[PDB]
């Protein structure tokens with residue numbers, strides 16, 4: 001069963017196998033007086049691993065590398081952060097120190113530098129416009145336009161029909177927004193629709209926080225974003 005927030009002490013990381021060569025990583029951390037779970041992705045890349053997003057901070061990300069080495073045993077050689085917040089780049093220095101080459105779009109790297117957060121080393125090109133898609137080893141990166149943030153990317157694993165929505169996609173059980181301080185509540189339902197248009201074949205959808213589901217998470221997220229807007 002997928003691990004839930006109360007089952008992961010802060011400082012520990014779980015790995016969950018979604019498909020052959022595709023895992024999520026689950027960590028926990030505090031934000032604004034409560035502890036929350038957070039998801040990332042791991043994708044087999046030949047004899048190497050591609051990491052999508054940190055485990056939300058340095059200590060969690062060090063434990064992420066430790067669990068990978070113990071359960072999977074292949075090196076993490078590249079990481080992509082899907083937007084500029086600490087649940088996505090917090091830990092990038094640990095990854096750098098351990099030998100991982102880190103990547104994000106130029107906007108993300110600048111919005112993170114601006115904001116005092118850690119900065120991925122390398123700029124992803126070809127994603128500066130809503131609708132853009134680029135290949136990056138075993139995955140596709142896709143910019144849907146602004147949503148949870150203006151820079152947020154989603155990630156698709158063709159091999160497996162896995163869509164990783166990051167923090168632009170909410171889990172089913174979530175009925176209220178926040179954090180929306182950096183969101184575009186205007187563009188957000190549209191960006192969700194662009195995602196629906198590009199990956200209608202998606203069998204597995206991973207939100208940035210919470211339990212995986214199907215493409216129904218896209219419709220559900222739109223409702224929540226709009227319900228917050230009309231209130």
Ligand SMILES: CCCCCc1sc(N)nc1C(=O)O
Nearest residue numbers: 031036087167178179208209
């Ligand atoms: C649906 C979010 C639940 C809690 C709020 C938080 S905490 C964190 N690191 N990210 C978020 C986010 O909204 O993406």
Ligand SMILES: [Zn+2]
Nearest residue numbers: 083085148167
């Ligand atoms: Zn965020």
Ligand SMILES: [Zn+2]
Nearest residue numbers: 087167208209
């Ligand atoms: Zn988040």
